[PDB]
From a paper:
Caliciviruses are a diverse group of non-enveloped, positive-sense RNA viruses with a wide range of hosts and transmission routes. This was observed in structure analyses of capsids encoded by many species and is often a consequence of environmental cues such as metal ions, changes to pH, or receptor/co-factor engagement. The ability of P-domains to undergo conformational shifts according to environmental conditions plays a crucial role in infection, significantly influencing both receptor binding and entry, and enabling evasion of the host immune response.
Although recently, organoid and in vivo models for HuNoV infection have been reported, these studies are still in their infancy and most of our current understanding of HuNoV has been inferred from other cultivatable members of the Caliciviridae, such as murine norovirus (MNV), FCV, and Tulane virus (TuV). These viruses have been widely used in structural, infectivity, environmental survivability, and disinfection studies due to their genetic and structural similarities to HuNoV. In TuV and RHDV, this increased flexibility appeared to be caused by significantly reduced interactions between the shell and P1-domain in C/C dimers, compared to A/B dimers. While the purpose of this is unknown, it was suggested that this particularly flexible state could facilitate interactions with host cell co-factors. Nevertheless, the effects of different conformational dynamics between A/B and C/C dimers should be taken into account when considering calicivirus interactions with receptors and cofactors.
Numbering used by the authors:
A (entry chain C), B (entry chain C): 2 to 429, 435 to 494, 497 to 523
C (entry chain B): 19 to 527
D (entry chain C): 2 to 134
């Protein structure tokens, strides 16, 4: 441990570089390691940016908010993260350099703390003083090297062990004469000289790659999973769409397709129903039918109540007098379906909340001649009456104990970025022109399964237009949604740019490029 | 260099282990390398199987055929291949162990030769004796270590340099009393102790990963790009389908989608035409129309003559009297299309070979009331008349100087494995039930762009059914097709297994599992 | 000839509250490895796993027995490879050591990235391999993740002249650093390295697919390549599975509530719903059939040709009234989801079924066109319940069946119900697997059983799988090979699943 | 204990002669024997065939069948069996030579095991590896 001081160019203040070990490192003997694998000597000499190792302190940020929270692991450094795929186990700490863009005419302090494994992080700078910690001042801070121990009770780690953390928060609030001033903080890492790997194994792991390579396909090349016959023509933003309740176009890094979503939305769009006894009260044209369940023959409450991939477009509460969904429908015979034409259809019975506006097995079709217990093709294709983008945007409700996709929202100050397609009318039943949005396309998150996301982190994506004269930035969450930072009805982004991986960020990260 | 002999268990012969340097290694001083990066000492001690380092000598194989041809590079060894992604450059040779499953009651010889860079490989064992080489005998061979030089005229390599090769062929034919006897040959590699890397760089490269990780999605989860509204329900084999001329479902590792193929086949299935003056001679119902080209407005001969992703189903030469394609068609108005219903359509004019049975802009629709210069929706949906699987299987001809996909064939003794879907009839125009095949699905080769193929090598895939009580093996070629080895009309493989990467093989490799 | 592909790291055992020495003589005698026996043939494919072993006390006969009284252990094994090779064979095995937390690959290419040795059939005999104890902890507790030894075909077995097979056995001794940690009562969860079987003959065992009729034959048939049965299904892991029971006789009798209406175009064929004492809420996740109730096949859409046969009679205060024979079947005679389906809906050929009345159902025969072949294929599984999986013997093997003759019931009355005589096969009897729960099977291992006839003069060898079936190695093909049911089973050894029984049944006499 | 190898006439294989003590012999002091009676020195030098010491392995024979089972006693050797009639008691082990008519173009293995008194013989070659063998 030490500190050195440098005078600033103009002599109007100083910068400090400090090296500290808040907690002693306990160098493992590695006596139980079958082999000890040395790293290339240059890997100890290269400080790379840490995944999620970037935060901005505004004068708004409270001394209660955690700015950075990072596990002490091979994932801290680019080359140890790549190298670890080749190894069964690892041992040893990291040098963690906190680079602070401070200034002598500001005021305020950071605290950085080492937190042992199986201990929770407190939302308080007062409580962080109970840990091994350092305090930095914004007037003089420039570089702080934390010698972060690998805190363990085992000779070396395998995967899936619980790890010590670095935590950074504001100790004392940022002050400046200017309202626009920010302290930018960046964390870099290299393995300590005592860092080792333990056993060569083939480089196939569940653990996420340190860099994600994205195909460079434009959004217009990707399927809209809520309207598969129509191409994506814009990325779209609308500040009133504060939540998503869709069951189609729902994917996650962890679980794959969730809700009633599928990776072949074009081959799943078609369904079949068996036509029931009876019709909706007051509307004898509105014959009931039950969607056929190949996946759910015995109608188990834990498996989906609707066929995999079948339409989740909305029509509002108790609104069949006003608007409907539209489909091609035709009766089943040898080899296919007969007399296929456009009919109005909807979910439920236009009255009861358990059925109406609910994603479940019972539908009505507005055709007066449904034969009882006969099968009918159902290909959803449009909407009719007073229907519009906002009615189609709100899906029918999920219900019961099946594994539906949850309702999701962007963090405060952010907005969802949608994959949007134009769905055309068709005329003599008559449809209306409407725009369909999806939260995500399966063709983007396909690539993300092939690389993985680091646990607890989000992809910051550049979206590149005209080769780079415009670049948008979005956060793609592992929970499936993609999101933008906005200031100030609908807003349109061209669909012929391409996604490029920028970096890993925390869910709490504020995107610097603003839409 | 040396040789040692071991007596066999029963004393009925001997095995030899030989170490040889056919050509001297020239250890680079690395004086121009900015840094020299050491490998983990255990990487020099691990012999892994080489990509494509596996061949079977039958008594059928000629002393003219090249059995193995391998570039001396970091791609020879699993851990040097993974490590090289992290580095700008490399230097040094490889130990190459040729493991021969020989026997004392066989006869015959191998030759192994080192070939300098910018020299061609001869198809002759007589000419291989002009190189630095070794000869092995099948009675006594067990292990041969070749100390293979890194032959260069530069201090160290960057990517894209031309490399020295190991070549193995039969020197003298295999003989045995048994007709079933084979010599199995396997090649393993480790870097020589003088092997080094030169400069740490972020691990992002065009160079293919040594192991491919495949999503585990079943074929039924994947789109059929020749019939997007219908799911894949079987993988399929038919020994009469000796070639593929399709323009849809054509993908390559190198170029992506080729011919008229797309990564969103469901969003590209729809087209529009402008209705021309006149009709096919003798059939006044068969009104001409031109497919609209958004991608080709000025009708450039080098850009495609048909809209991206539009139907390439066959109907035979001069056969409109016998069979047609079927579509939904409707006239364009405000917001969409009016009076949409089923019509017969086809390519060309049912007579001239430049138009009939040709994938080009001019079609006819069998509707007597097409308004001149009005636009019509076209959604292909089935086939009519004498149409069948074999008529749909042969696409319309490619023509002219646009960048079409070439006609491809399996190597002799192999057969294509097809993604197959059932396309149902529709009835009063009346369609017929037909099965549509695709050569490949975009959802499988999506994964292969995210890993790459080693240049000149093919993926051997296991296809895993019932968790492993049955496993098929297929070769997936970088040229887009997938293929099986067959002995002894159509054959059906279930679509609910999953693909698993087995290994890299040469195009010449004979799959050991036979369908 | 001693190979350590990965180094053995000697634990100090500092942390151990006691360190328990083994008898010095256990380190000096190599025993056979409990499951370490496997076969390679010219048919055995490249990249196939022949042997998988956890590196644990279970690798040796004496340390597997001793481990029953210890909480924990440390140290590796010295393995020796005994190869019954021949002068004409060529080929290679690969032996790989997998670290504790790592998944086993499915190809030779990925397996060569582990610490390994390549073993040629000309020189592999008496080769010694150290199996190291890989850990990051001072000693193991029970239930810890363990390193594996994996043996795979690297180059396939080929022969000059004649087509031999090679049987490979491992032998083992613990390395000198091997120790145990803490005395516990001799009841611990590791399988005994020897299973002792009580000498009960097959005829003394129940047939769980026909409880009233004794087993008369062990049976083999080359066309019975599949079992889909729900009855007679027992595993060492789970006990009785898929609607099977440990008292098949007591479970044989169902009741059904008669249901309104009748089969379409067949008004005599009245519906009923089987009553479900164990599933009264009618959950889709619980079985749709009473436990232990008949799973006899009666063809597909086959009611005009063949039916099942039972005694039935309506419930009363005094038990059941006017009990006599009827034809019955599962579901409808048409709908694919009901017909030939193991589910709650049945029909009975009795016009007299009163609505909401409850009827006894005692299955006891089959009628018309029903044969052995049709009884052998059970009604289909359907829905989300824990039904027994459809199983096959591995390539080149046949199931051994427990067989009983079911005699024909005849009536002389015009239109009276009439049965045809049939043989009923069960995949396993609960009376054989009885002792396997107490002993355990080693992880991923098969029991090689001797079956002993004529005082020892004829010995059939069968492989008893922990998934609940016996198989035999067989040559030729036959639709009626009989083995006497008056022998007894004797445990021979544990074997890998892909071991090929040497003792081949000449299936065409 | 030792092993020696001889090349076959034609050099098409080898024969092995092995001497082994699977279990240590415990030479009795004979302190309680009233007299100790020596055998003629030539009786230790004569290997006779054992009563029941002959079996044929066909490819039919299972690795579960016991081929030979013999008590270690004066009845093993012709002259010790005749001599023992003249004596009340005996002590000491036997050299047992197993002569195998093998060939280099066959395959397969024997196991030979010493089994202590009051222990049962298992019908399994897997279980015979638990004994000195």
């Amino acid at each position: 441990e030490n500190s050195k001081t440098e005078q600033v160019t103009g002599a109007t203040g100083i910068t400090q570089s400090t090296v500290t070990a808040p907690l002693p490192e306990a160098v493992s003997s590695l006596s139980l390691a079958p082999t000890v694998n040395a790293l290339d000597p240059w890997v100890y000499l290269n400080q790379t940016e840490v995944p999620g190792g970037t935060f901005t302190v505004s004068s708004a940020t409270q001394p209660g908010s955690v700015l950075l929270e990072l596990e002490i692991s091979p994932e801290l450094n680019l080359y140890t993260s790549h190298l670890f795929r080749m190894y069964a186990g690892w041992s040893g700490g990291f040098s963690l350099k906190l680079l602070v863009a401070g200034n002598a005419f500001s005021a305020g302090k950071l605290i950085a703390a080492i937190i042992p494994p199986n201990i929770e992080v407190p939302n308080s700078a007062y409580l962080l003083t109970g840990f091994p910690h350092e305090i930095l001042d914004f007037r003089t801070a420039d570089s702080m090297e934390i010698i972060a121990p690998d805190i363990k009770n085992i000779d070396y780690h395998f995967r899936g062990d619980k790890l010590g953390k670095l935590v950074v928060m504001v100790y004392s609030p940022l002050r400046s004469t200017s309202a626009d001033f920010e302290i930018e903080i960046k964390l870099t890492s290299a393995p300590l000289p005592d860092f080792k790997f333990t056993m060569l194994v083939p480089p196939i792991q569940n653990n996420a790659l340190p860099i994600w390579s994205i195909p460079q396909a434009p959004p217009y090349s990707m399927v809209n999973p809520r309207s598969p016959l129509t191409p994506v023509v814009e990325l779209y933003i609308n500040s009133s769409y504060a939540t998503c309740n869709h069951q189609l176009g729902r994917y996650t890094i962890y679980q794959g397709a969730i809700g009633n979503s599928t990776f072949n939305p074009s081959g799943a769009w078609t369904a079949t129903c068996t036509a029931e006894a009876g019709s909706v009260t007051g509307n004898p044209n509105w014959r009931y039918a039950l969607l056929d369940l190949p996946d759910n023959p015995t109608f188990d409450p834990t498996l989906p109540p609707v066929p995999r991939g079948f339409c989740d477009w909305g029509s509002g509460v108790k609104s069949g007098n006003k608007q409907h969904l539209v489909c091609f429908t035709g009766k089943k015979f040898a080899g296919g379906f007969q007399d296929v034409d456009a009919h109005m259809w909807d979910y439920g019975d236009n009255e009861t909340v358990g059925l109406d506006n609910t994603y479940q097995r019972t539908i009505y079709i507005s055709d007066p001649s449904l034969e009882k217990d006969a099968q009918y093709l159902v290909i959803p294709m449009g909407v009719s009456g007073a229907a519009n983008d906002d009615t189609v945007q709100v899906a029918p409700n999920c219900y019961g104990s099946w594994d539906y996709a949850p309702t999701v929202a962007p963090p405060l100050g952010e907005q969802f970025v949608w994959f949007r397609s134009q769905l055309p009318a068709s005329k003599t039943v008559n449809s209306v022109p409407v725009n369909v949005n999806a939260l995500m396309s399966p063709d983007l998150i396909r690539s993300a399964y092939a690389s993985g996301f680091p646990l607890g982190k989000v992809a910051l994506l550049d979206y590149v237009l005209f080769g780079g004269s415009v670049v948008r930035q979005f956060k793609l969450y592992p929970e499936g949604y993609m999101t933008a930072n906005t200031t100030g009805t609908g807003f349109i982004i061209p669909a012929d740019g391409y996604f490029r991986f920028n970096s890993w960020v925390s869910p709490s990260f504020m995107i610097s490029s603003v839409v």
